[PDB]
Amino acid sequence: PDLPKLVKLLKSSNEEILLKALRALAEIASGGNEQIQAVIDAGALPALVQLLSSPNEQILQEALWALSNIASGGNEQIQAVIDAGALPALVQLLSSPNEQILQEALWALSNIASGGNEQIQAVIDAGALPALVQLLSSPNEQILQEALWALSNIASGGNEQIQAVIDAGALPALVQLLSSPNEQILQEALWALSNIASGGNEQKQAVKEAGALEKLEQLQSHENEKIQKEAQEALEKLQ
């Protein structure tokens, strides 16, 4: 098959050959989980990371496509990506002017954070815990949405996983965010608060300490039905 053959093409030298390979390197990943594994063993995981650190925009716009394509696999397949050493290589892309590249930067990163606790602990370590919260207060909603997926994904584990979140400083970026005329941010933030509150008393009060309760109380009398129910479930929770 042309599985391994494509891997070699991921060694720079020829841009034409490299690009052509990229296109036919991700398209296959978006066909089945088993297909992803084939790419891993093939030795493309580490070959892709190297591309992440390239000036070309085309090779980059594609490098992410095939990348995240794997991050959306299984809890195990997602680990392979980390073992290759793309965690830090991807975080860098986040500091790119080309929004197009930044978008994918999250579609892959956050994707991995949605794995398991065993992987989360590794993220909260070096991962930009507090830095991720700062993004929450960004104008470009595009980054805001994805930013929520990453942070939230990290708070999808045991109690210890929830604590790490509050420590980062999401209480303010969330609570204060509750006061938003945007239905999106309204449900988003709310969904985040409840998540953390789901933990113990330390995880609950921690949030309410900011003043989310107020925003929640007012939500009780919100037009939207869904927002009303969710708001009621989060309110009592804090208690």
Q: Which are the contacts of 101, defined by CB distance < 8 A and separation ≥ 6?
A: 57, 60, 61, 64, 93
Say which DSSP state 157 is in: S
End-to-end CA distance of the chain: 60
Domain extent, residue 218, equals 1-239
Distances (CA, A) of 4 to 21, 77, 232: 11, 18, 54
Three-state secondary structure call for residue 210: coil
Smallest CA-to-CA distance from 179 within 145, 213, 202, 134 is with: 213
Three-state secondary structure call for residue 74: coil
Quote the CA–CA distance of 85 and 64 in Å, as a whole number: 14
Burial label, 112 (beta-carbon count in 10 A; 0-12, 13-18, 19+):
buried
Smallest CA-to-CA distance from 82 within 55, 32, 48 is with: 48
Quote the CA–CA distance of 219 and 40 in Å, as a whole number: 47
Give the amino acid at 65: W
Give the amino acid at 104: E
The total of structural domains in the chain comes to 1
Q: For the chain, how big is the Rg over CA atoms in Å?
A: 20
> What sign results for the dihedral spanned by CA atoms 102, 108, 111, 116?
negative
Q: Which are the contacts of 140, defined by CB distance < 8 A and separation ≥ 6?
A: 99
Distances (CA, A) of 160 to 28, 50, 119, 124, 223: 37, 34, 13, 11, 36
In the chain, alpha helices (H):
3-9, 15-26, 33-43, 45-52, 58-71, 75-84, 87-93, 99-113, 117-126, 129-136, 141-154, 159-168, 170-178, 183-197, 201-208, 212-219, 225-238
Q: Which residue has the tokens 């930044």?
A: 102
Ramachandran category for residue 85: left, alpha or beta (phi over 0 → left; psi -120 to 50 → alpha): left
- Residues 192 and 152: beta-carbon distance below 8 Å: yes
CA angle 236, 238, 239 (to 5 degrees): 65
> What sign results for the dihedral spanned by CA atoms 109, 113, 114, 118?
positive
Q: Which residue has the tokens 């989360």?
A: 120
